[PDB]
From Swiss-Prot, chain A:
The record marks E131 as: Important for catalytic activity. Homotrimer. Pathway: Antibiotic biosynthesis; carbapenem biosynthesis. One of its GO terms (molecular function) is transferase activity. Belongs to the enoyl-CoA hydratase/isomerase family. Catalyzes the formation of (2S,5S)-carboxymethylproline (t-CMP) from malonyl-CoA and (S)-1-pyrroline-5-carboxylate, the first step in the biosynthesis of (5R)-carbapen-2-em-3-carboxylate, a beta-lactam antibiotic of the carbapenem class. Also catalyzes the independent decarboxylation of malonyl-CoA and methylmalonyl-CoA and the hydrolysis of CoA esters such as acetyl-CoA and propionyl-CoA. Catalyzes the reaction with a C2 epimeric mixture of methylmalonyl-CoA to give a 55:45 mixture of (6R)- and (6S)-epimers of 6-methyl-t-CMP, under standard incubation conditions. Changing M108I: Forms the C6 epimers of 6-methyl-t-CMP in 92:8 ratio of (6R):(6S) epimers. This is Carboxymethylproline synthase. It comes from Pectobacterium carotovorum subsp. carotovorum. It holds the Pfam family ECH_1. Changing H229A: Forms the C6 epimers of 6-methyl-t-CMP in 70:30 ratio of (6R):(6S) epimers. The gene is carB. One of its GO terms (biological process) is fatty acid beta-oxidation. Unusual member of the enoyl-CoA hydratase/isomerase family: in addition to decarboxylation and thioester hydrolysis steps, catalyzes C-C bond formation leading to a substituted heterocycle. Glu-131 is important in both C-C bond formation and thioester hydrolysis steps while it does not play an essential role in decarboxylation. Keywords: Antibiotic biosynthesis, Transferase.
From Swiss-Prot, chain B:
Changing W79F: Forms the C6 epimers of 6-methyl-t-CMP in 17:83 ratio of (6R):(6S) epimers. It catalyses: (S)-1-pyrroline-5-carboxylate + malonyl-CoA + H2O + H(+) = (2S,5S)-5-carboxymethylproline + CO2 + CoA. This is Carboxymethylproline synthase. InterPro entries: ClpP/crotonase-like_dom_sf, Enoyl-CoA_hydra/iso. The lineage of its organism: Bacteria, Pseudomonadati, Pseudomonadota, Gammaproteobacteria, Enterobacterales. Malonyl-CoA binds at A60, G61, G62, D63, F64.
Length: 238, 230, 229
């Protein structure tokens, strides 16, 4: 559910769900996590680009209907572990990571992108965190955005549930660059080359130090998120 | 010192101090806290708007020679408790809260507005954190603004002590919308309806999780500020 | 290695390394830390400006070649020097103003972030190029993440770009931009404004404000060392 390509020392991972919006099914998560782990352990790889593919979305995220229909506390927990594991997978890559966002980055797709060292988007792309509008809890998205972009920006995004176009994303500093769709993947590879040229040792050590509090935050969020659901289903199942 | 009105499932609380600037006297704090607590417990209420009233200020904040003449250990701490209690009262509202800011939001008024889930202001409104300029400690305002808007933005605001007009507030991201005074309350009620339509359970849970570290910060601030004047 | 002058209640500390770029040698660090401590203890001083000097840089930072070559007594000793320098600024309880002309690079950039306010010249540049040069940036990252949040920090340390005046305004790294010839006067002016704030409220507020920054730096000191080992 991904393909792996190389621009010399740059590994390009293209998401290839049968659906062109790259919804994070279990299978797609696993393929991504596995590809990232291979990139990280492959010495020939010095930087990594993740891309939804041409005329596809970065990720429409997880199925909101599926999450609302989950019948057990444990179902939602295993799902929260999946979500947090996906993001930790990205944070634990000690080489430069670049997200090339086209189409939609929704929910998990938006959170996923925030794990990358740098983000570029197409001028025609959109970021969305619409969980609350759709009756989905947004505590994971909130914790992540509040860590990455601060409290007030997080509140605005999560409570307005708007589609954030390129100019809006520039304004929020959610992305580092905006380019045309047709130029995006190349622009991302280029930035990946630039960061791959940074001496690896100093980069690895720095990124580790940088990402450590983020990783810690996500682990706290893993634990904290399960808790309200344990109590909800304890009541119902009585 | 407040009036409570309803736009269906939206509770509108209008601050009604005798003074048109809605200074946070102990009476107005109590009325607000009491109204918020009613809104929070009332099942018919699915969102809350707080508004200073037409041709009034959101709040010019605390009485400021009161805090200079405030001089006894017990009295300054009583006052720090009041301030934090006021803000906690807003943070602990488990339904959407909207601040509709017209006129001035100064000091405690500014800090008070930062407790709301969303803020709209009038194009002719001003936010001010002038404490230091006036020889008033700003450690509580600093703590809050540092949490909500980050350290460097907080430094800028608390050390410059400027009147922040609508464009300046938009640039700082202190508010979510700017409208004309005459459209403000209606725009705030509209946003309260939008947020009220979010399924309550997911909203409540999310908000609790969102505001938890804010609440915790305020408690640390309560303890730190009182240990200063002690 | 520094000059110390007065504009009434404003102490102006001008960095005067023999090199025009004011690199943080051990001697410059010590002169600056001593001048700051003097300024903080002198009752006649109500505000502090630090300036690289006319036609000079604020600071090109530390010698990256001297870092690349550091033993553990020395690596711990350098980290300590860096953090001690910044704590020295944070522990000044009077208003502190950085007047940045020329370059503020690496430690120079980090140093400037310790001040209550920053002004820069329209022709000045901030740079955090450590990673581009094979130098660890965990200290600069910790600091910038604290001051300007995570995503801005990431962008700055991973891009390693020269940040001109407009780019620093966009990042909110500085409070004002003025021409080089007007910079020091504008900085002294802001120092006068902040010096007029009643001292007791100011001191107590600033202490509460800077406390989590100081704590962060201390955690960073320890972490850079736990790591080196």
């Amino acid at each position: 559910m991904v393909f792996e390509e190389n621009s010399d020392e740059v590994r390009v991972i293209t998401l290839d769900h049968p659906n062109k919006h790259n919804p994070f099914s279990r299978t797609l998560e696993t393929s991504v996590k596995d590809a990232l782990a291979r990139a990280n352990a492959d010495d020939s790889v010095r930087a990594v680009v993740v891309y939804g593919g041409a005329e596809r979305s970065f990720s429409a995220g997880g199925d909101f209907n599926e999450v609302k229909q989950l019948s057990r506390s444990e179902d939602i927990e295993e799902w929260i572990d999946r979500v947090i594991d996906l993001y930790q997978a990205v944070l634990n890559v000690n080489k430069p990571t670049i997200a090339a966002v086209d189409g939609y980055a929704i929910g998990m797709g938006f959170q996923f992108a925030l794990m990358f060292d740098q983000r570029l988007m197409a001028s025609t792309a959109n970021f969305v965190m619409p969980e609350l509008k759709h009756g989905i809890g947004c505590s994971v998205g909130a914790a992540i955005l509040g860590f990455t972009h601060g409290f007030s920006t997080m509140q605005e995004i999560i409570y307005q549930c708007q589609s954030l176009d390129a100019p809006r994303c520039v304004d929020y500093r959610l992305v580092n660059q905006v380019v045309e769709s047709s130029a995006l993947l190349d622009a991302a590879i280029t930035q990946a080359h630039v960061m791959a040229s940074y001496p690896a040792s100093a980069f690895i050590n720095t990124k580790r130090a940088v990402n450590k509090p983020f990783i810690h935050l996500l682990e706290q969020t893993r634990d904290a998120s399960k808790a309200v659901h344990k109590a909800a289903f304890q009541a119902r199942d009585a």
